[PDB]
């Protein structure tokens, strides 16, 4: 494989003599040219790894080198000084002085230009992370809320233009808050160019898709493929009008981009650099599980997969330092984990954790929480977890079977008793929620509905407000990046007629995706409401965790309660959390604090707790009590 000082001097040949002698004196090539040195070799190295021998490796590097460059000496200075800001910081991802939000434009603000006028209460709410959902053009009518991509330059018209989005990140911003935005990477709309002239058969886009003459290929795979949307179509291809089957891991309108091309990856790699220069603080790798398919095995986080990320890490460590990835990985623990790494995806969701609150919620025993904070919270070095609550997507019930077997749990008959739980389907249960892809050949199944939906605030449960700062209180605590679903921050729910628009009947995730009530943020500084009790319970949690040292970083120890219904853990030997699960009173004993000092002041309720006698917490209380 070639080296750095090789390919630099040939970037330069596209310059006269004249120019050549100006570019390599200039700040931003000397910047180019120490990270080349420093991080091209991982580059090179990722990108062999997968590619080996090919013919067209060589050439595709040189390629996108040389708009690496030119991408980096257009970037703006604002985003220089950034990207030399999160060098010398690699873990400001790790600060408690972060808090995300993620939103719909349309949904929550009409537009860009009617969310650019939100960003006041944003900051009012003390966020420093904004996630926007997909921005760019798609498929009129389906386009799986927007992730059916036709344009990854062309903003939804609906939304506003190029434009409205360069002023909505400088706006955010001015603001101190990170734009974040989707990098959806695995797969395009039918409607893309590259996928109709790859269909037409254009040699230019020839092999940018996995496209099969007939069911041989596809019904091999299928064998060990796992359905994502079976109520769309079975296995992972879909048939063309001419006969031909295409890799439709998602929906029929989604194709799965063809990475075993490199120049998919050149491709993918161009259009990253465009979203990074537009101001992006961190991109939503979509799908990262995907992006490899090897006969005989699952197709979902292969080695190539995880290679190929890294060096698009590399990419941006090159040209565009300030760019980190948040991974989108949905899938078994062991695998979840894999993606998070400073030379990979630095930060990236944390499903186990959301998945295991709405678990606990059900069985009000802490033992699976327990366990998940006790062995898979801690990471790597210069990495966070992003822990939620809620999604745009569906809840999926990804804790470990083998996690689960330890505690005497069969993972199957857990799952049934869950699901049939949050869709209110078992006697006493508080959930509202939808059942989404059921489906009849594995008995899997997945939820919908929003936080406030799911903990009886529809029918107005007593208990239902204090749920949900039951839940939120450990996003926000336990150690990296919360991520606030807004609209749950003044109890939204569902939106009860979704199945009444034709485009989005036969997805129940749109019933938790409504739009901005207008009543309830009229409401939020009220405490006679839900939506103020909700609100500025919430808020006070927010405004302590950025002000409290104590919450910084992400490590954490859990503390046995020695109450199954009592979660417990401590950030920094300093603050002592716990969090009860049941709708009744229960105690911690003394004898269990005896370690802990004889008074501790609560952050949550503002008093002085003593925790050298019995401990009783009220139902779904939480205690952030200060023992250092
Ligand atoms: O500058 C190094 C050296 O490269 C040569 C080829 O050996 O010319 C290349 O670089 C020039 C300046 O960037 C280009 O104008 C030219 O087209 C390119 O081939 C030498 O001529 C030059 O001394
Ligand atoms: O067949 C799977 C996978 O292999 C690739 C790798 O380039 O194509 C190879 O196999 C095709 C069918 O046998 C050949 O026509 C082709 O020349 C060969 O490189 C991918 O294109 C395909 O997805
Ligand atoms: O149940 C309401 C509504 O949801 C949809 C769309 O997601 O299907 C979900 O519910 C069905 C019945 O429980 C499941 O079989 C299906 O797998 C699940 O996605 C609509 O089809 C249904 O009308």
């Not at 001015?174 to 254009?202: K, L, P, Y």
């Not at 698009?312 to 948040?326: D, E, G, H, W, Y």
């Not at 508080?430 to 939820?447: E, I, K, L």
């Amino acid at each position: 494989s070639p080296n750095s000082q090789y390919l630099k001097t040939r970037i330069l040949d596209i310059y006269t003599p004249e120019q050549r002698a100006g570019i390599e004196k200039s700040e931003d090539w000397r910047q180019f040219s120490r990270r080349m040195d420093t991080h091209f070799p991982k580059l090179m190295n990722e990108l062999d790894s997968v590619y080996g021998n090919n013919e067209a490796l060589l050439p595709m590097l040189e390629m996108l080198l040389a708009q690496a460059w030119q991408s980096y000496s257009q970037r703006n200075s604002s985003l220089k000084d950034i990207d030399i800001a999160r060098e010398n910081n690699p873990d400001w991802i790790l600060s408690n002085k972060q808090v995300g939000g993620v939103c719909y434009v349309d949904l929550f603000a009409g537009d860009l230009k009617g969310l650019k006028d939100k960003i006041p209460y944003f900051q009012e709410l003390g966020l420093t992370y904004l996630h926007l959902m997909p921005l760019f053009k798609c498929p009129e009518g389906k386009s799986d809320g927007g992730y059916a991509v036709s344009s990854y330059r062309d903003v939804n018209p609906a939304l506003g233009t190029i434009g409205d989005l360069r002023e909505v990140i400088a706006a955010l911003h001015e603001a101190g808050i990170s734009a974040v935005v989707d990098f959806i990477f695995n797969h395009t709309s039918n409607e893309h160019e590259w996928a109709q002239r790859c269909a037409a058969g254009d040699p230019l886009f020839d092999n940018f898709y996995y496209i099969f003459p007939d069911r041989r290929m596809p019904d091999q795979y299928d064998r060990t493929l796992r359905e994502i949307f079976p109520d769309q179509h079975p296995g992972g291809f879909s048939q063309l009008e001419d006969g031909r089957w295409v890799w439709t891991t998602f929906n029929s309108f989604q194709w799965d981009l063809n990475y075993s091309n490199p120049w998919v990856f050149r491709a993918m790699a161009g259009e990253m650099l465009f979203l990074a220069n537009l101001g992006v603080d961190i991109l939503r790798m979509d799908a990262v599980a995907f992006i490899w398919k090897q006969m005989g095995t699952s197709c979902e986080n292969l080695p190539q997969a995880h290679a190929l990320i890294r060096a698009f890490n590399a990419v941006m460590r090159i040209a565009a330092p300030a760019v980190f990835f948040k991974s989108e990985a949905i899938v078994h623990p062991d695998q979840v984990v894999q993606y998070i790494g400073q030379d990979e995806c630095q930060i990236g969701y944390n499903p186990l954790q959301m998945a295991l609150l709405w678990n606990t919620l059900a069985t009000r025993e802490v033992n699976l929480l327990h366990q998940a904070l006790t062995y898979r919270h801690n990471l790597p070095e210069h990495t966070a977890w992003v822990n939620y609550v809620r999604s745009h997507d569906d809840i999926g019930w990804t804790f470990a079977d083998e996690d689960a077997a330890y505690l005497g749990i069969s993972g199957y008959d857990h799952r049934q008793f869950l699901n049939r739980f949050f869709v209110n389907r078992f006697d006493g249960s508080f959930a509202r929620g939808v059942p989404f892809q059921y489906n009849p050949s594995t008995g899997d199944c997945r939820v919908s509905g929003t936080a406030a939906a799911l903990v009886g605030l529809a029918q107005d449960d007593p208990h239902a407000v204090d749920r949900i700062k039951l839940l939120y209180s450990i996003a926000l605590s336990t150690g990296g990046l919360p991520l606030i679903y807004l609209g749950d921050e003044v109890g939204t729910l569902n939106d009860d007629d979704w199945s009444q628009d034709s485009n989005k009947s036969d997805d129940s995730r749109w019933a938790h995706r409504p739009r901005y009530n207008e009543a309830l943020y009229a409401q939020r500084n009220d405490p006679s409401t839900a939506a103020g009790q909700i609100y500025q319970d919430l808020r006070h949690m927010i405004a302590v965790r950025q002000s409290n040292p104590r919450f910084d970083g992400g490590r954490l120890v859990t503390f046995n309660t020695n109450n199954k219904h009592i979660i417990g853990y401590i950030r920094n030997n300093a603050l002592l959390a716990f969090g009860n699960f049941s709708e009744y009173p229960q105690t911690v004993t003394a004898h269990t604090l005896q370690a802990m000092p004889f008074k501790a002041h609560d952050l949550i309720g503002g008093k002085t707790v003593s925790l050298n006698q019995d401990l009783t917490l009220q139902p779904y209380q939480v205690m952030w009590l200060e023992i250092a």
